[PDB]
Swiss-Prot record:
Domain PPIase cyclophilin-type: 7-163
Chief location of this protein within or outside the cell: cytoplasm
Catalytic reactions on record: [protein]-peptidylproline (omega=180) = [protein]-peptidylproline (omega=0)
Lineage: Eukaryota, Metazoa, Chordata, Craniata, Vertebrata
Notes on activation and inhibition: Binds cyclosporin A (CsA). CsA mediates some of its effects via an inhibitory action on PPIase.
Gene Ontology terms, MF aspect: cyclosporin A binding; heparan sulfate binding; integrin binding; peptidyl-prolyl cis-trans isomerase activity; RNA binding; unfolded protein binding; virion binding
Keyword Phosphoprotein: yes
Protein name: Peptidyl-prolyl cis-trans isomerase A
Assembly and binders: Interacts with protein phosphatase PPP3CA/calcineurin A. Interacts with PRPF19 isoform 2 (via N-terminus). Interacts with isoform 2 of BSG/CD147. Interacts with FOXO1; the interaction promotes FOXO1 dephosphorylation, nuclear accumulation and transcriptional activity. Interacts with integrin ITGA2B:ITGB3; the interaction is ROS and peptidyl-prolyl cis-trans isomerase (PPIase) activity-dependent and is increased in the presence of thrombin. Interacts with MAP3K5.
């Protein structure tokens, strides 16, 4: 059963930018991969469609997935509560790594980040569960709207998202 692929169609102040696709490592972190997959399809009745990337820091990361409060304070998983750190098998090895944001041990919800640099200090603290497969260039384009404190200079949104074959 092949690892799923999901896509985000990104816009900038409502104007299309491009598509980023991700391989989700369901073979290694199935519970975490499944959360992200089902939030991307919206099949549980909530998820990432229409949400923003609220914190973009060039040379570090692009963080999104707070579909309830749009600022880093919200989000929820498909599991009715925040869920555990599944494992730390995979490491933050460089740009394109897809990993869970959190606020302490075992507090995964919906927020995630895309690395734009190697972030090894996060190893063992944030669960890595995917990587960018296509459109790393689009992540780099997104990154340019960020700033040192993370505030974006244009609204960066997931205008559509879902699963590709």
């Amino acid at each position: 059963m092949v690892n799923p692929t999901v896509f985000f169609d990104i816009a900038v102040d409502g104007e299309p930018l491009g598509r980023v696709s991700f391989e989700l490592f369901a073979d290694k972190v199935p519970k975490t991969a499944e959360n992200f997959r089902a939030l991307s399809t919206g099949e549980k009745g909530f998820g990432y469609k229409g949400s923003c990337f609220h914190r973009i820091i060039p040379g570090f990361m692009c963080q999104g997935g707070d579909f309830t409060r749009h600022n880093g304070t919200g989000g929820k998983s498909i599991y009715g509560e925040k869920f555990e750190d599944e494992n730390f098998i995979l490491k933050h090895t460089g740009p394109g790594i897809l990993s869970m944001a959190n606020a302490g041990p075992n507090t995964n919800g919906s927020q995630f980040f895309i690395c734009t640099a190697k972030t090894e200090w996060l190893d063992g603290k944030h669960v890595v569960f995917g990587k960018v497969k296509e459109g790393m260039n689009i992540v780099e384009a997104m990154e340019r709207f960020g700033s040192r404190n993370g505030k974006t200079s244009k609204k960066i949104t997931i205008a559509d998202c879902g699963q590709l074959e």
